[PDB]
Design a protein around this ligand. Sequence first.
Ligand SMILES: [Mg+2]
Ligand SMILES: [Mg+2]
Ligand SMILES: [Zn+2]
Lengths: 563, 559
Amino acid sequence: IRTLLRLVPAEKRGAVAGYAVLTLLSVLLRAVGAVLLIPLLAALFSDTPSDAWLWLGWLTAVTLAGWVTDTNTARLGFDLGFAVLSRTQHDMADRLPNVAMSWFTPDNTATARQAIAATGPELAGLVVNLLTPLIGAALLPAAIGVALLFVSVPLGLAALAGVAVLFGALALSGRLSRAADKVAGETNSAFTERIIEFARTQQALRAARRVEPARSQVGSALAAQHGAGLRLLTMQIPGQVLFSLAGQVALIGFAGMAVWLTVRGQLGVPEAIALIVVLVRYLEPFAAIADLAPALETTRATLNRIQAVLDAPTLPAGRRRLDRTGAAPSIEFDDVRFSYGDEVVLDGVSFTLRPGNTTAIVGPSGSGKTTILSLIAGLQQPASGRVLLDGVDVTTLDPEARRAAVSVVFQHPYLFDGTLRDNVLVGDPEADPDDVTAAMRLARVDELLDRLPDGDATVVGEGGTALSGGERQRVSIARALLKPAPVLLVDEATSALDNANEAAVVDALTADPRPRTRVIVAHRLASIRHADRVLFVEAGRVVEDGAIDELLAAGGRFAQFWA
Amino acid sequence: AGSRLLAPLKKPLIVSGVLQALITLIELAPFVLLVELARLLLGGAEAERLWTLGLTAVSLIGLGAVLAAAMTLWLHRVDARFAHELRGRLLTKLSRLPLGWFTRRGSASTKQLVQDDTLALHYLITHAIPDAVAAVVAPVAVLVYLFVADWRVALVLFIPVLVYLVLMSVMTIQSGSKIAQAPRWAERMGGEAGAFLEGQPVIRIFGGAAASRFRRRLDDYIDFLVSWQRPFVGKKTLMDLVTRPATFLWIILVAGVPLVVTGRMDPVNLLPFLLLGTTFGARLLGIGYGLSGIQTGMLAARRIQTVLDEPELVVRDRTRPGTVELDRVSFEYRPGVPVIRDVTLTLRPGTVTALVGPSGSGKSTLAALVARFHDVTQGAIRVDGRDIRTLTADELYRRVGFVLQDAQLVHGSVAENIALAEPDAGLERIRTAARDAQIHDRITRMPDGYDSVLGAGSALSGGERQRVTIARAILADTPVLVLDEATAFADPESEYLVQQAINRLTRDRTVLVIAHRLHTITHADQIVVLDDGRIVEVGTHDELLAAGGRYRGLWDSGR
Ligand SMILES: [Mg+2]
Ligand SMILES: [Mg+2]
Ligand SMILES: [Zn+2]
């Protein structure tokens, strides 16, 4: 319950206090309704049974008040559960794009997926499914025990003593089954990730024959998950036993005290028979809590994953804004240094890109030139040093102004599951259809429209897997060119393109009418014909720079690199 | 429909029905004993009879709880065992379906099928039948016994049962459609959630957090949950209050006290109602909550059995070494969308075959057909004479190795990624395979060495994960190799080295090379130009240029 209050918005704290007051009031009315039976039957069996009308009226009033309170508790619990759901899911959706790139480790990415995947109805009705009955069942025998004190002090003390073993059984059941449940949750998450990999990497797994359950990674994860699942069922046996023993101990304590008072004459026979029914009402929560306790640990793990994602380290950001009406800014690296963990990618790299010129970045593979584009676009940030757009440190820029300043063609072009037009329109959803068609024409997407059966309405798979490699690349290029960013970063836009489409797209990138600062990464000299300046990036540092013809005549690493 | 899936749980389910019928009768037995205890207690009976009934009642309360705990332990074991078996069957089926199944269905759907649907069968195959028999036998046995005692108060017990049944029926009807739509919505949100995490760089630069498709459909999904769960929970809690033991205990007394106060009833006959009349409410509430679970489970069975009934890449009965022979092959991903048109091509040992052409012309599809990821719609593909439809997966993939355009890497150690084709291969073989692909130099600089993990956020670069897949294919050492754009991202120096290593390995092997870098396939013994799904010219590099066909145009455009 403690972790839930952290996730509740500050807006809904007013409803939580009302929820808690009504939940306590509901438990009190249930206890008073159960204990009112004792005066009721005591008068009912007397020689003047008409006295029972007074107690029946109180029982009816407590019952109707029980209906109203528990209905309002359900309504408030429903609102609180969805209020927590909507706000925490929006916070995860709004925070994750700002989370640092290095945070998305395979374990953290699994955690993020599970947290978002918790949007289903199980998390939504949590306050009604779990907290409302858990709090009610836990406090009901205590409330009956407190209420019995008005009838007989030692009898109420006996009920409270029975409540002590209940919390004792609850604590021991939790502590015994925590380790097994934690391992069960870990293995279940592992199996989910391997299923996702199994469906995504299905081509490569089949070719490698690691696809049968006897051989595949998912098969091993299933074996571990089933083993952990059966162990969890084993370690819940002491929980079931301890709750049963707690119920029997409470029954023996309650019945023995009532019998002891009846023998001593401090308790009438009709009160004792009424107490049999109260004992049954007293022992029902001992069984309800047993059914609710296993779900409590699983919920705690779920909310822990949600809180972990909300606690992710957001990337630094400021509020500066470029003073350009979509005009070309200058770009510079000022002694930039960057590393992935202990691996240094860039150290001492420095360059300056003029606003209206097109610059090429080349060099061996694994040399850090995609890192340079990512730092320019703000996806990464330096460990030390600073990168400036138009003389403004991008780490101090508004995130809206940071992402409205750059449009990027990624090395591995990812497309979302949807129509081809929607992927193109992601660059600028409010685009004029004249502007969209111009973007499609420049990217040679018009070939796809005329050649594909469905045109721009062609459905793309998860990723760009329902299209060819060279076709998802052109759709991504159309997506980048549609956006009116003054900085255009091209990360191998012609890797998977034939020579004809490569030449057409390469001419289009330079022929893009609006002014921009263009940074192009290429492994093919035909794709950087128009670049005004070069940045040869080898071993993480810009070894040499100049024009293409200038470096070719120089006979440095450029000429050998293009031999 | 669904019963075909649950046939193996024939006898466990009937045994559960009978055992829970006996167990709940055992649970009702103490309250009958305690009623007899109460009647004797008013009668001033001998203490031995009071102790006997009292101690027997407490003993049977323990016995009922122990048997109930013992049953659900066994029945959850049976449910866990069946779910493990069913998940194994689903993985085995998915291991041999046509691979267009995965592409059109996605990965979120596969996660829902294997894991969530088998989990959705939980309440059906361990809680449905016990709750159903309990919710039938206990109200029937109680209400008959209390009808015999005094029908007058039994009728006011019928009232909340009728009210509860009306609430159960309208809730089931009202939420039936929404429950049917629920797995589709979870499927779609699973896809959006996966894309929101996988395509993060696209989400960041383009649109940002606010304009993303994920939040657009997240609002629709949560709105659907609110519209589904609000009236559903509303009926769900009215069922609690109607079937609440306090509600039964109140209405029992409302019809008892006026009869007791008047000369219409003796208060001794209220003892069965107060002791038994409140105990069947919680059992009726079982199926009241459980019909939604039974609906979800039955649909989940339908969604699972529909996949186990899916057509697969069956192995036929009909039943030069290293010769892959396409013959009149045609293929269409969708009906009426021919992507390959009457291709005839023979791949022979010792020859390097280059497959070039315009993008989107079906080259990778032809390579996939060689892998038998999809079966040819017409014609036949033969490996060493044997049609691939007569070859098992072991026999097929032991002959044809593949480097795929998408350099897919699996979560796990680098050695596990290179040693995917043969996980039992020694570490020396893995090192030599990596050195051939020119990735060993990068691997040694990783912090954990070959044991380093290649998950998301720790993966290699595009040009380096590609060399890992080339290292994977080199380690496989198949008599036939199919390079679907190797060195797509490799620089010209690394490209030359790895191609030199490939050209060293595959002299006695059959090579199919798909390449856009036409300068890398000038040495090929046979260049095949594929345009719009049909071959348009074949020959050597000099022959194609002299012919002046489409290859001449593409070669000129490359300059
Ligand atoms: Mg790159
Ligand atoms: Mg391809
Ligand atoms: Zn269960």
